[PDB]
Amino acid sequence: IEDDIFRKKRLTIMDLHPGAGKTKRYLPAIVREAIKRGLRTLILAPTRVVAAEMEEALRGLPIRYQREIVDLMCHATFTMRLLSPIRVPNYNLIIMDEAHFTDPASIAARGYISTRVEMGEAAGIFMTATPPGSRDPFPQSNAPIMDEEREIPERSWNSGHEWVTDFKGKTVWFVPSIKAGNDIAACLRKNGKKVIQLSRKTFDSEYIKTRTNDWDFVVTTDISEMGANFKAERVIDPRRCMKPVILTDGEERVILAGPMPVTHSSAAQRRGRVGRNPKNENDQYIYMGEPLENDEDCAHWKEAKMLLDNINTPEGIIPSMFEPEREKVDAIDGEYRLRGEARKTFVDLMRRGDLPVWLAYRVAAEGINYADRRWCFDGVKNNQILEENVEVEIWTKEGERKKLKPRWLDARIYSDPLALKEFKEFAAGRK
Numbered sequence: 001i002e003d004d005i006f007r008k009k010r011l012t013i014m015d016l017h018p019g020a021g022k023t024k025r026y027l028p029a030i031v032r033e034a035i036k037r038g039l040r041t042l043i044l045a046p047t048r049v050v051a052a053e054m055e056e057a058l059r060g061l062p063i064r065y066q067r068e069i070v071d072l073m074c075h076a077t078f079t080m081r082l083l084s085p086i087r088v089p090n091y092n093l094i095i096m097d098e099a100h101f102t103d104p105a106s107i108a109a110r111g112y113i114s115t116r117v118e119m120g121e122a123a124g125i126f127m128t129a130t131p132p133g134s135r136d137p138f139p140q141s142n143a144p145i146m147d148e149e150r151e152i153p154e155r156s157w158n159s160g161h162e163w164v165t166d167f168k169g170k171t172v173w174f175v176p177s178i179k180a181g182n183d184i185a186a187c188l189r190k191n192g193k194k195v196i197q198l199s200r201k202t203f204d205s206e207y208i209k210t211r212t213n214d215w216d217f218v219v220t221t222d223i224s225e226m227g228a229n230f231k232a233e234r235v236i237d238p239r240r241c242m243k244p245v246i247l248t249d250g251e252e253r254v255i256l257a258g259p260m261p262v263t264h265s266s267a268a269q270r271r272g273r274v275g276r277n278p279k280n281e282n283d284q285y286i287y288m289g290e291p292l293e294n295d296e297d298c299a300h301w302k303e304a305k306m307l308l309d310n311i312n313t314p315e316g317i318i319p320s321m322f323e324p325e326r327e328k329v330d331a332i333d334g335e336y337r338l339r340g341e342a343r344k345t346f347v348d349l350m351r352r353g354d355l356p357v358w359l360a361y362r363v364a365a366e367g368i369n370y371a372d373r374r375w376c377f378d379g380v381k382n383n384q385i386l387e388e389n390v391e392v393e394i395w396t397k398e399g400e401r402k403k404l405k406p407r408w409l410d411a412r413i414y415s416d417p418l419a420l421k422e423f424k425e426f427a428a429g430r431k
Contacts, residue, residue, distance in 0.1 A: 141275025
């Protein structure tokens with residue numbers, strides 16, 4: 001912490017290995033210095049959980065979470081209210097915790113902050129264990145970690161994989177999907193194991209659970225790679241994941257690329273769950289397969305450009321992407337900017353609709369109104385959704401019973417139980 005890190009026109013990439021206490025120690029130090037300077041400061045957390053925690057963790061210092069000089073909120077919220085018609089404070093300093101989150105809003109925020117410091121309006125700080133360009137799945141830890149490759153059951157073993165159920169203590173198992181999660185979680189319970197499952201839609205409500213001591217396994221997905229900790233001694237990481245891809249053939253649509261190798265940084269973040277307390281020396285990272293920097297075509301990059309394009313700084317300038325991420329998207333900085341009314345629908349479709357950026361963008365760009373759900377049923381024959389080979393049908397609030405075949409198809413809308421239940425409520429016009 002210098003006196004340069006706060007100087008406007010500065011963007012500091014605070015690279016600290018997992019456990020360096022970027023949150024518990026560095027943050028308060030920085031926020032403390034911020035206040036002493038009168039700087040209007042914004043603190044961005046990855047999730048609301050990590051936000052709420054940071055709050056009690058920043059006792060005494062004058063902060064307003066989401067009269068006081070420093071605000072604190074989460075990536076999603078920030079970029080979402082950047083999309084809104086109301087201006088955001090002209091913050092002098094902006095601290096983005098875990099600035100490696102590749103979800104659309106995180107990438108957009110990063111680009112917005114990037115722009116603010118370039119325009120010289122502010123000084124920003126990105127804290128992350130895996131800065132842009134990290135290519136080491138085995139970063140240093142605070143304690144020894146036994147890295148051992150092994151054959152990790154992907155579905156649910158029927159009779160033999162003893163190392164996994166005999167383990168002494170707590171395990172955190174990173175699974176590629178909720179489908180995979182459920183099968184494995186189910187299996188573990190069969191073997192008398194209390195299991196906690198986490199996912200993007202479940203995190204902020206089921207995560208607190210891991211703070212009790214009665215759980216043997218935590219079956220989770222990507223989000224746990226974003227500011228999430230567990231009193232675990234062993235991480236199981238098959239190093240697999242799903243990737244939304246915008247297929248251009250047939251008709252543009254979003255597909256969920258079959259289970260594929262995770263990124264190098266992801267492997268690190270996952271492994272980062274252990275080797276935390278220099279006390280324990282028996283932490284272990286069981287893994288399978290190898291990383292791969294194969295993600296140039298992940299929908300998120302374009303989805304973030306969609307968000308950024310509809311963001312406006314106090315002046316009529318549109319935010320650029322963060323430099324190390326500009327290559328990801330090939331558009332022009334104005335490409336996806338919508339006009340007044342359509343843009344508000346774009347936001348409603350995201351905030352109230354709970355629809356993916358892409359899907360929300362398509363519907364809005366088509367001049368459709370938020371409450372018009374006709375598009376949920378007038379898509380081509382190919383866009384029919386089948387739950388169990390059986391054609392899903394909706395009972396609209398209009399008493400009608402229509403089949404579910406959206407004009408625009410996005411796998412994230414039906415690829416998992418919670419997703420489909422929600423989207424059905426949407427086509428039903430009950431949202």
